[PDB]
Design a protein around this ligand. Structure first.
Ligand SMILES: [Mg+2]
Lengths: 126, 365, 216, 34
């Protein structure tokens, strides 16, 4: 298609089959389809653990730096991937979500202790 | 209060004015509005200048309205606004002048301080202190207490009306409070400092009874709560000032009454506008009442309280100082007339040149 | 080729359409009119967001304040209730030019210009003011201008340089050793060149779009 | 920890649509209950 307006972006293009997702990191005009025309492939992401239990990310860090230097935006999942790698700082919401999960498990642990204490009262009743 | 010389219209009536029939000029303006074309400031100026009857004022009022709602509303000239008030007084249409002044947003009549004094003084001499008060409130809304002469006249009207009005509504307290405060701030005399404490007291009452938004909304006043704290500061300043300054006794009683009344009372626009950490004004009233008694004791101990009523103090102040202001204002008035005359001539000349060029354009076309 | 032929109707339509837009341009009094009972704009039927309902009933528009002032308040200072609540430091516009909408029966819609002073720091040139049709403006009183505009700048404490990300730092140190540069200096990013304005900083009104004149 | 004045500024801006204030999160990840 003949796009008018838009910018280059670095995003994940979904491949694979049903229940078997696989991603291609690509640089593409933002108005293009998710799996359609791209400019360059900048790596790949396999989100399923392999035989060794490792999720495999490939990053062409030379070309990624080239396209960020030319104005390429980043999708939020790709900003998270660069943070885990260490190439970018950890994303604000990666830290916030980790804090929310910590606060949510603290409640669960406290409730289990309260239930155990309530169960202890049942033990006292016999 | 003002002298006959201050309100004399010999100088305005002796101005050089072009003679244009109102009917002819009316047609020109009507055609421009029909064609959605801008009207000249000189055109509306010529209309007001050539008013010759009471009926003509009614027509001019309509055209002043039309000019305000036209592309060149901003260019209404100062002398045109002053001449309007002068013509209204000449033919007995004082109610019309006050109407346009109150409906400034619709007619665009923003007089200067000299013009305000002319209208305000007419009512004072006639004894219509209800209309004169309206002029003061109009001056207050425009924050135009610059000339000293206007401050003296404004304080005389305010204090005279307050004495008659035993009962004040919350809107009246707000308007009187603001008027006293703004006019009082300019004056450093005892009457000036008394009006500041009087103004803050009234506004503080409305703040603690109806909220701070009733004080500042649509008023030339600040939005930060704590008007009674500003009132107490005036007492603390006078008491501790090295120079000998005095606050009228009448004001001190007003503040004490306000503190007592507030202390022991008996669609979606509902917002808390103050931070939780900041103490509310209601909680601070106990401390406010202690400061008042301490300041009053120090003031009385230092003999810095004036038993004389505020109406009597203002009358003496007006008599002593107003004569001098009249001479200064009249000197500036003469200069303004000459400045206006020169500016008007320039506009007339520029109009003649473009019309001559317009003929050349048609000749070329 | 040569079988491609002119399209006169398309040419005529484009020009004619553009001409009509210029002739029937709407005014600010129409585009930004509001029905306060429903808080919905009649021209387009757009319902205002929920977080704006309280202020639409509780605050004034800019030219509502200026229409009551001589010379439309040239030289006066005006602030916004949103700024007053968010920023302790003075934020205001110094009005320089004001073009009211004469069509409006109360001269309550129009455009304005001024010099911006945001968070105590003043710009050097005047530019057009954005969000003039918002119910957020508060005129500053003349007697309170001196106290309002008083600001003392604090020493800036936001860091000027920060470390590099963990991987990008190792790639820099690795390249140093490869090229023979021997040093234990820590790579540092410089943040001075790229410091962001606050999100609520006034934007450029001149480059902003205007809504179309087709009613819904 | 945010400054107390800033927490009050947000309680005013979003008055009527607020959540309970959250304190510092646990220092480590709480061990999953089993
Ligand atoms: Mg925005």
């Amino acid at each position: 298609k003949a796009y008018h307006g838009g910018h280059l972006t670095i995003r994940l293009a979904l491949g694979g089959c049903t229940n078997r997702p696989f991603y291609r990191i690509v640089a593409a005009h933002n108005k293009c389809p998710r799996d359609g025309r791209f400019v360059e492939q900048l790596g790949s992401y396999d989100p399923l653990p392999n035989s060794h239990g490792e999720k495999l990310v490939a990053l062409n860090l030379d070309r990624i730096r080239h396209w960020i230097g030319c104005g390429a935006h980043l999708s939020k999942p790709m900003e998270k991937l660069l943070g885990l790698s260490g190439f970018f700082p950890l994303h604000p919401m990666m830290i916030t979500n980790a804090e929310r999960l910590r606060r949510r498990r603290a409640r669960e642990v406290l409730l289990a202790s309260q239930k155990a204490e309530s169960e202890a009262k049942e033990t006292e009743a016999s | 209060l003002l002298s006959a010389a201050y309100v004399d219209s010999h100088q305005w009536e002796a101005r050089e004015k072009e003679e244009y029939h109102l009917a002819d000029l009316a047609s020109l303006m009507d055609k421009a509005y029909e064609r959605k074309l801008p009207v000249s400031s000189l055109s509306i100026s010529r209309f007001v200048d050539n008013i010759a009857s009471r009926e003509d004022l009614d027509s001019a009022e309509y055209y002043l309205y039309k000019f305000r709602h036209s592309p060149n509303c901003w260019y209404l000239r100062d002398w045109t606004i002053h001449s309007w008030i002068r013509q209204c007084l000449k033919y007995g249409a004082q109610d019309k002048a006050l109407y346009t002044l109150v409906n400034k947003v619709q007619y665009g009549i923003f007089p200067d301080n000299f013009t305000f004094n002319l209208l305000m003084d007419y009512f004072i001499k006639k004894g219509n202190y209800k209309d004169a008060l309206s002029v003061v409130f109009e001056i207050m809304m425009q924050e135009a207490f610059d000339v000293p002469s206007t401050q003296f006249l404004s304080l005389y009207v305010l204090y005279r009306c307050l004495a008659e009005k035993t009962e004040l509504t919350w809107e009246e307290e707000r308007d009187f409070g603001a008027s006293l405060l703004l006019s009082g701030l300019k004056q450093r005399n005892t009457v000036g400092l008394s009006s500041q404490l009087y103004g803050y007291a009234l506004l503080g009452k409305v703040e603690l009874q109806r909220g701070v938004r009733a004080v500042y909304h649509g008023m030339p006043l600040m939005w930060t709560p704590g008007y009674l704290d500003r009132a107490l500061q005036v007492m603390e300043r006078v008491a501790s000032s090295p120079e000998d300054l005095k606050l009228g006794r009448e004001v001190l009683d007003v503040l004490d009454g306000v503190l007592k009344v507030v202390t022991s009372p008996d669609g979606s626009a509902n917002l808390v506008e103050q931070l939780d950490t900041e103490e509310p004004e209601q909680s601070k009233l106990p401390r406010y009442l202690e400061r008042f008694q301490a300041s009053r004791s120090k003031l009385q101990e230092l003999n810095r309280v004036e038993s004389e009523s505020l109406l009597t103090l203002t009358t003496q102040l007006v008599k002593e100082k107003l004569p001098a202001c009249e001479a200064e204002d009249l000197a500036t008035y003469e200069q303004k007339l000459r400045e206006w005359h020169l500016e008007r001539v320039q506009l007339i000349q520029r109009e003649q040149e473009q019309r001559e060029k317009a003929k050349q354009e048609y000749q070329a076309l | 080729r040569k079988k491609v032929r002119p399209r006169l109707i398309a040419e005529l339509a484009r020009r004619v359409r553009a001409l009509r837009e210029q002739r029937n341009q709407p005014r600010d009094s129409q585009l930004y009119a509001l029905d306060y009972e429903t808080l919905t704009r009649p021209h387009s039927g757009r319902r205002l967001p929920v977080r704006a309902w309280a202020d639409v009933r509780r605050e004034s528009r800019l030219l509502q304040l200026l229409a009551r002032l001589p010379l439309f308040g040239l030289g006066r200072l005006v602030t916004r209730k949103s700024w007053l609540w968010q920023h302790d430091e003075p934020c205001y516009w110094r009005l320089t030019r004001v073009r009211p909408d004469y069509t409006a029966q109360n001269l309550d819609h129009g455009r304005a210009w001024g010099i911006l002073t945001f968070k105590g720091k003043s710009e050097d040139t005047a530019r057009e003011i954005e969000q003039v049709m918002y119910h957020d403006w508060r005129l500053v009183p003349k007697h309170e201008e001196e106290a309002f505009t008083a600001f003392t700048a604090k020493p800036e404490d936001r860091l000027n340089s920060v470390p590099y990300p963990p991987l990008l730092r190792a790639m820099i140190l690795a390249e140093r050793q490869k090229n023979g540069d021997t040093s234990v200096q820590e790579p540092l990013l410089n943040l001075e060149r790229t410091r962001m304005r606050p999100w609520d900083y006034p934007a450029k009104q001149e480059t902003k779009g205007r809504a179309k004149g087709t009613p819904v | 920890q945010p400054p107390e004045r800033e927490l009050s500024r947000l309680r005013r801006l979003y008055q009527g649509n607020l959540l309970e204030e959250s304190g510092p999160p646990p220092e480590s990840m709480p061990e999953m209950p089993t």
